Amino acid sequence: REPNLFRSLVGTSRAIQQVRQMMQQVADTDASVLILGESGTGKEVVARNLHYHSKRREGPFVPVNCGAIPAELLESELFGHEKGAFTGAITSRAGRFELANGGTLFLDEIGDMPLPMQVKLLRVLQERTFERVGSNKTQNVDVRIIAATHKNLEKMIEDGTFREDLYYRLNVFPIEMAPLRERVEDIALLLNELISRMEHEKRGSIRFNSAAIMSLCRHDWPGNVRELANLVERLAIMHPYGVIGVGELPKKFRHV
Amino acid sequence: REPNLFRSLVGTSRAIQQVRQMMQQVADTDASVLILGESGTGKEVVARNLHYHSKRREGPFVPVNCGAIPAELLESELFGHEKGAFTGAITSRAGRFELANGGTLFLDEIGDMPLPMQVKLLRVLQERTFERVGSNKTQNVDVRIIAATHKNLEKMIEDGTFREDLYYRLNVFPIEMAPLRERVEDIALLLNELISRMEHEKRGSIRFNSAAIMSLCRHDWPGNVRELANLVERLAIMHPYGVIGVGELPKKFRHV
Amino acid sequence: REPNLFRSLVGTSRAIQQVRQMMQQVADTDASVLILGESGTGKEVVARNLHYHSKRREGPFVPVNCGAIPAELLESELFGHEKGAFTGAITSRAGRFELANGGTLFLDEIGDMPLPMQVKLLRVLQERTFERVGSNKTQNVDVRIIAATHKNLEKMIEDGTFREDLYYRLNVFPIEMAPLRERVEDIALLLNELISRMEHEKRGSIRFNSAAIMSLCRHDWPGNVRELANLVERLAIMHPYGVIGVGELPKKFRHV
Amino acid sequence: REPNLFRSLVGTSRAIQQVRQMMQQVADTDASVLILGESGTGKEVVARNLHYHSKRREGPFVPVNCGAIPAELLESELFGHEKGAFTGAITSRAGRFELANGGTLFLDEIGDMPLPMQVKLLRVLQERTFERVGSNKTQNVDVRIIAATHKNLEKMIEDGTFREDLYYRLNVFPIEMAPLRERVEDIALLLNELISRMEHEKRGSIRFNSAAIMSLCRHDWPGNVRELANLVERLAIMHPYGVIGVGELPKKFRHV
Amino acid sequence: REPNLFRSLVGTSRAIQQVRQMMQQVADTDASVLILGESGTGKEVVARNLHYHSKRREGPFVPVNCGAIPAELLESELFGHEKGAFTGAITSRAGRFELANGGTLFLDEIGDMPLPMQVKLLRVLQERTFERVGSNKTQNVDVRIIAATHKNLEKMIEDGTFREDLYYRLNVFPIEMAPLRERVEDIALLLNELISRMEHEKRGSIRFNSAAIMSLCRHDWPGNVRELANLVERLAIMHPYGVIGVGELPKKFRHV
Amino acid sequence: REPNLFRSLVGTSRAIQQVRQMMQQVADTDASVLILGESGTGKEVVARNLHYHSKRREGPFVPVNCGAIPAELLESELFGHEKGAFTGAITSRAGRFELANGGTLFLDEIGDMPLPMQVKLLRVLQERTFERVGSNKTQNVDVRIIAATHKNLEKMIEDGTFREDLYYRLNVFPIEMAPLRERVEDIALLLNELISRMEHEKRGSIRFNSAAIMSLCRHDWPGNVRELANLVERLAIMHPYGVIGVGELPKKFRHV
Ligand SMILES: Nc1nc2c(ncn2[C@@H]2O[C@@H]3COP(=O)(O)O[C@H]4[C@@H](O)[C@H](n5cnc6c(=O)[nH]c(N)nc65)O[C@@H]4COP(=O)(O)O[C@H]3[C@H]2O)c(=O)[nH]1
Ligand SMILES: Nc1nc2c(ncn2[C@@H]2O[C@@H]3COP(=O)(O)O[C@H]4[C@@H](O)[C@H](n5cnc6c(=O)[nH]c(N)nc65)O[C@@H]4COP(=O)(O)O[C@H]3[C@H]2O)c(=O)[nH]1
Ligand SMILES: Nc1nc2c(ncn2[C@@H]2O[C@@H]3COP(=O)(O)O[C@H]4[C@@H](O)[C@H](n5cnc6c(=O)[nH]c(N)nc65)O[C@@H]4COP(=O)(O)O[C@H]3[C@H]2O)c(=O)[nH]1
Ligand SMILES: Nc1nc2c(ncn2[C@@H]2O[C@@H]3COP(=O)(O)O[C@H]4[C@@H](O)[C@H](n5cnc6c(=O)[nH]c(N)nc65)O[C@@H]4COP(=O)(O)O[C@H]3[C@H]2O)c(=O)[nH]1
Ligand SMILES: Nc1nc2c(ncn2[C@@H]2O[C@@H]3COP(=O)(O)O[C@H]4[C@@H](O)[C@H](n5cnc6c(=O)[nH]c(N)nc65)O[C@@H]4COP(=O)(O)O[C@H]3[C@H]2O)c(=O)[nH]1
Ligand SMILES: Nc1nc2c(ncn2[C@@H]2O[C@@H]3COP(=O)(O)O[C@H]4[C@@H](O)[C@H](n5cnc6c(=O)[nH]c(N)nc65)O[C@@H]4COP(=O)(O)O[C@H]3[C@H]2O)c(=O)[nH]1
């Protein structure tokens, strides 16, 4: 497809070793999972996996980042409106819970997802149903829940904004991501992984010379694995077939 | 092997078309062939072919450029010395006529090959034999003769140095090469041919960007196809995997 | 996808060199471009490029050949009908200007596009808006315009049918295509380009022997690059894996 | 290398299944093996295997077909002459027993190998040594023996020519080859095996259309697997890249 | 796409040879074809072919297995409902005859397709039209008919359930499939065919060792080619990159 | 060829980074180089490189491990005997200094190379010549010297056995290898490097599952890179095409 994320649990480091260990624990289960760590540390891929090697791989998988949807529509996107009961609901659409009936569904920066919405959220993981936008009726739903916030919820609770009964039911399996800069053993490795995706995205393929590679083991990766993903995609279309490096990368990681 | 010459009769141009036409004429035959044209215009390859699609492909093929051998040894290299009859002949070696018995044998810049030697040469293509260094005996030899001089023999005759009975027996099939710079339709074409050899010579492979390619269609090629061959080999080891161009080639063909 | 056009600005010839030169001129710009030349001389590809290496590659690209659409619908296809204001408009569709908001949009044989329609056309490149089918309202539109007529407009003007103010605003960048038969240096080249597309279209791959290739450098190509494209596609499905040639091509280019 | 034999124990048929069964029996052993069957039924390959999956793969393997060597030299080729003790022995050469010390050594059409020579042969597999040409000395030799005659020895014994004590020591493990025409399940299979060798022998690769393949399942194969090997090699150089068939093969197997 | 069926008329055996012979007979024709044999013996592929090498390949191809659709909807799926004339017909859908106008349409286990429906069926292959769900109007239709029942119709007729005038018009070309277990020459062959599909379905590729292959030539294949297809797909995702066998397959075909 | 060593300066770790740094220092030079570190830590490859990116790549390279040659012959192997001046010198052979005239020559565990021999050694790097076995004559020699001892020479000096003037002239460029177990960042990396060699050594190719890989990052590598090289070669012939791991490796690195 067009996604921009890949095989990403490749790795030597003990860092990523133990995050794989984490994954073993919880992989038999239908119970909820919470992924914590900085953004762009490959959370989605961690989830996407849990799906496949679940008992429900044959079903669907819905990602929804609560970030990018505005606040007002957030309810219909998730639950669904029968045409008319929402001022300007022209379509009899389905929510993502409708959609994910069968497989699992993925939630991004839950710490973002508003106080009003997270209440209803509590229901459906206790209620076993939900009511569409403007409907007195409850609908049966088999769905496994995975969610990922970049933020700390222990402090989201004290501050109020997060309800301590959501949290109680989502921490059956904590998994804690490691930032890429704690994983530098593993740079090289997935860089291979990368051009092996991209080689079949665009005309061409690149290759990093050792010069720029060490240089990439230098950097911060505040944006982590996602940041790097963006970067490799750029050059793979920018100079295709070419070597890469030595200093053909952004003037930023010009590192000694 | 380690040779540095290739598939080289690739080509659109009428120039190389008619040199292929030439090849058709003479390809059924066991009779001698003379190839004329500048050096490094791929003569050898023209011969090497005539061999394969002869009736004798299953036999051998000996190249000898009269240039690079010194003058004194020229006779033993070609005819062979029984140990002792040459002051310091420690080995009972064979000549190239011994060697090429069966297949064919290739002679470079015949215009170079000394007056003394070319006399004996006349013999064996009339004599049907030759005598080794220091031997009263004649040896039966089945060999087809191909030869290539960069120089004009019509003027080698008037000036003396070439015997008009050699020439009479070698022009059963003239073939006249076209200099590469008369063949620029065909640059691109064999450039492909080239990295397809070299890709399996060294680690890597290159690729020319369109920038440098037009730039290569500019140049003289005084050294012709051979010159270009040397050039592609250089960069294929120099920067491997990389793009080539735009101006990574020698400061020479920096051409607008 | 299923298109049947490719990498096609491959080429040695000065012909295609200067048509690439043309492309350099106008590639920074948002201003209109007019491509002139015979049909099937690869015009679309010339446009498609200008898009990618524009500032708007990330947007869309809409091709519409005024030829194949009938005359009556031509307005709604381009501007769009709100259900009902067109006798039998059941759908609230969008036009191609709606569609191309963001990227650029491509027009074929403008010399065909009727007198009535080209008037409205003038508006939107001056008006900065357009009104849908049966709507009193104007809609803001950011779109760059490229168009290609096989016909001569200087004579389309004298004859009347083309308005001299369209033409004034479309000739900011003329580009003039070269017919394939003026580009025979370049046949071979893109023939490679071709089986390298098609090899991943169908089971198999072909290859042209030198016999049929020279034979293809013979031909007219009244249909030019498009004609050849059709031809290679045919055999690539007709005899797959096979050699091609010598006379397995249509009895037409049977050429000495 | 240049051999012309391959992976050839590929196969569905019960015929070749049981000849593989045979191979299992005897594969642990250092004791002699006799392979019986028509020529060109791939005997050598059957041996070559037994070597590799012996305990001595790390050693050498010498093939000698008693056929192609003349009768007089047969002794020195096998045992070796110290320069001078053979009228015209200029070289202090080694025999094949010298040579195969370590690995194993392969003998073809033993039924051919003369009465005089097979006597000495008996010695070394009992004697544990041999004496070079013109030497009073015996030399220690560790060698495993495999041999293959196209002919029946039970009748070679009655007729005299074969000694009943050779035979007694060589039938520790009989293996009996199946003629290719008893193995037609398996044609297709190794035909794949074939172009997968040859594809890396010469420029190109071929492919058989279904037409000619059934046609090849028709034929006798008096020459068996070897015959077919010769055949595939021919076309792989004859028409390269091309389809093969339908009737591009020799006018012989033109079969309905 | 996601189908799970392939190149499947690969084969040595006389069994599959004559089923290919069958295909030759009827391939010029627009007249109806009936395919008989057990399920999962690759019927669809036999049809899909007849399409391509028909005169109508450029058109569409609709498969409909009368099995999996319930009984009540069977009419609208095939003929199509204008919104409203069917209690709960919200959509103005098309039938498969609408759909297949142009190409051909495929019917599975006709022996299943109910008495009521097969009457109307008779009409359209005589009537040259059909009437949508709840419409007094007849619609012109150019469609070629192929159908496949696992069951015997001669006994479907005596028992009643099948009308002897359907049958009369469908047996212009009988083709009779051979069960896979009558085709064991051909196992190996298409197994190759298989990983060559699947290698481009999922990450990886497998390979069968000879151990498990003979073991697969053992089995029943009550499910025939389809059964095997399911099987190869399983392991290709189960253990990817790995060898397969020896006993990594289901405990079922554990065969001596 | 048949060597069993590869591309081996692949690596993330600071360990191997600084050993590459070392290499930069000394790469312009003709002066002697000493490589210290445990055996099997890839010393040869470190040298082999220095050659290529020297000014003398176009020349030869001779490896001689003083270990495996016995003590008595050590002089002729290095210097060369004219037939007769050594009791049983039948051949007029050349030494390795003869041989390496032009390129460079490599010496293994110099700490092994006997007191007698290392004296003469001193000469030639001061003398600029050497005398063959049994010759009053000195021969001019242009050779660059690289040598590698597993042992510590500072203590080889105190103990006597190593002469403090050898050492003075060999430490123009020290390079100090890092044991593989200090380089575990880099395991994975060169493991790739490995099957990419071996894939073209034997039929097949393997692949390590993540299971066994972490397990390989566990181990000691007393034998270091060489040890691992031996290991990968083993399985690449042992189980070919297969996965490797999880515990198909020797019962030794069975590591938790
Ligand atoms: N188009 C394409 N996209 C790719 C490829 N590799 C990774 N991706 C994308 O990036 C994610 C990487 O997943 P993973 O870590 O390999 O983790 C994968 C892998 O663990 C496994 N998996 C997924 N598909 C297959 C498959 O077809 N065969 C096998 N053997 N395993 C699979 O389940 C997870 C499912 O991942 P996804 O949900 O697909 O999510 C995948 C996929 O969506 C690829 O080769 N092609
Ligand atoms: N010389 C030549 N080769 C061709 C052509 N079309 C396809 N190929 C070859 O086919 C491979 C895959 O083509 P694909 O299936 O479209 O798969 C393509 C396609 O998925 C995508 N892609 C590459 N270039 C373009 C492009 O210009 N436009 C679009 N839309 N997609 C592209 O990337 C994939 C791989 O491209 P590559 O890495 O080049 O690898 C390409 C290239 O080897 C052609 O017109 N000329
Ligand atoms: N990563 C990795 N890949 C390896 C290694 N060894 C072989 N390969 C792969 O195998 C291909 C051919 O190896 P080859 O048979 O030796 O054939 C080689 C060999 O003939 C020659 N060659 C390349 N590099 C060297 C080198 O450093 N030394 C020598 N002596 N020959 C080389 O060029 C051919 C092709 O080299 P490539 O173009 O790279 O293509 C190589 C490369 O893809 C390795 O140690 N590491
Ligand atoms: N599926 C497929 N289709 C192909 C391929 N190559 C060409 N085509 C089709 O034919 C047109 C040829 O474009 P171009 O001359 O290569 O000119 C291309 C090329 O100049 C550049 N371009 C397009 N896509 C890519 C890409 O993915 N990577 C890079 N590096 N350049 C691209 O922009 C132009 C965009 O062309 P398009 O609009 O795609 O239009 C492309 C594409 O639509 C291919 O490999 N795969
Ligand atoms: N032996 C065998 N090999 C298979 C099979 N399926 C796929 N392959 C191999 O996979 C390559 C690409 O398959 P693909 O992804 O479908 O990509 C295919 C697909 O895009 C298209 N294609 C080829 N044949 C057909 C066909 O019969 N029907 C359809 N719908 N598409 C086809 O062309 C592409 C390349 O086909 P190829 O050139 O053959 O190259 C094929 C072929 O090497 C199979 O069933 N048997
Ligand atoms: N150059 C080349 N020649 C080939 C190839 N395949 C077969 N041949 C020639 O044909 C014979 C076929 O042997 P096999 O039946 O595969 O039987 C082979 C196979 O059973 C096994 N074997 C040999 N070499 C290797 C290897 O490198 N790796 C593995 N895994 N097995 C081997 O031992 C037997 C040894 O056969 P050979 O004595 O070599 O004799 C081989 C070989 O000499 C090939 O891929 N390349």
Ligand SMILES: Nc1nc2c(ncn2[C@@H]2O[C@@H]3COP(=O)(O)O[C@H]4[C@@H](O)[C@H](n5cnc6c(=O)[nH]c(N)nc65)O[C@@H]4COP(=O)(O)O[C@H]3[C@H]2O)c(=O)[nH]1
């Ligand atoms: N276009 C082009 N491609 C080249 C050239 N040289 C090598 N290749 C490519 O490299 C592959 C292997 O080359 P190789 O290592 O010499 O391995 C060669 C070589 O071993 C042998 N071979 C092929 N043609 C010839 C020839 O004309 N003369 C000789 N002596 N050997 C040949 O067959 C192998 C494979 O040939 P292919 O099947 O073509 O596969 C070739 C071809 O893909 C070239 O000059 N032009």
Ligand SMILES: Nc1nc2c(ncn2[C@@H]2O[C@@H]3COP(=O)(O)O[C@H]4[C@@H](O)[C@H](n5cnc6c(=O)[nH]c(N)nc65)O[C@@H]4COP(=O)(O)O[C@H]3[C@H]2O)c(=O)[nH]1
């Ligand atoms: N994606 C993909 N799918 C494949 C491939 N090979 C087979 N299939 C699927 O499995 C069926 C096998 O068809 P077939 O026996 O090869 O029989 C094929 C073959 O006989 C021929 N055919 C189909 N497409 C092509 C093509 O693109 N090129 C050529 N030369 N022949 C084709 O017509 C029949 C049409 O088959 P389909 O209706 O496509 O149905 C194909 C296709 O739907 C493949 O390589 N890629």
Ligand SMILES: Nc1nc2c(ncn2[C@@H]2O[C@@H]3COP(=O)(O)O[C@H]4[C@@H](O)[C@H](n5cnc6c(=O)[nH]c(N)nc65)O[C@@H]4COP(=O)(O)O[C@H]3[C@H]2O)c(=O)[nH]1
């Ligand atoms: N190391 C690495 N290699 C990659 C990656 N993405 C693509 N490749 C390489 O690209 C080939 C085809 O990728 P594709 O076009 O997506 O075509 C893929 C895709 O169609 C499908 N596929 C494989 N794995 C997955 C997966 O995890 N998820 C999904 N959705 N599809 C997959 O199977 C095809 C072939 O997969 P392969 O057999 O592996 O063959 C793959 C693999 O060689 C990656 O993230 N990492």
Ligand SMILES: Nc1nc2c(ncn2[C@@H]2O[C@@H]3COP(=O)(O)O[C@H]4[C@@H](O)[C@H](n5cnc6c(=O)[nH]c(N)nc65)O[C@@H]4COP(=O)(O)O[C@H]3[C@H]2O)c(=O)[nH]1
């Ligand atoms: N057959 C084969 N053998 C291989 C290959 N790669 C490595 N080896 C063996 O292992 C050594 C690894 O060298 P390196 O670290 O790549 O270091 C290499 C590399 O740095 C460079 N080099 C050597 N050959 C080539 C070449 O053909 N092209 C380029 N670009 N560089 C080369 O010089 C060094 C010379 O190494 P060697 O003396 O050859 O020693 C090489 C070579 O002998 C390969 O692909 N094929």
Ligand SMILES: Nc1nc2c(ncn2[C@@H]2O[C@@H]3COP(=O)(O)O[C@H]4[C@@H](O)[C@H](n5cnc6c(=O)[nH]c(N)nc65)O[C@@H]4COP(=O)(O)O[C@H]3[C@H]2O)c(=O)[nH]1
């Ligand atoms: N099915 C089949 N395929 C063949 C055969 N011969 C060659 N190939 C293919 O050709 C590739 C290289 O063959 P190669 O040039 O001999 O290069 C061979 C050769 O150098 C060596 N090799 C492999 N097997 C053997 C063997 O059994 N005996 C010997 N002596 N060498 C082998 O390893 C290289 C690569 O072998 P692969 O990894 O298999 O990769 C092989 C394999 O893909 C054959 O008889 N049957």
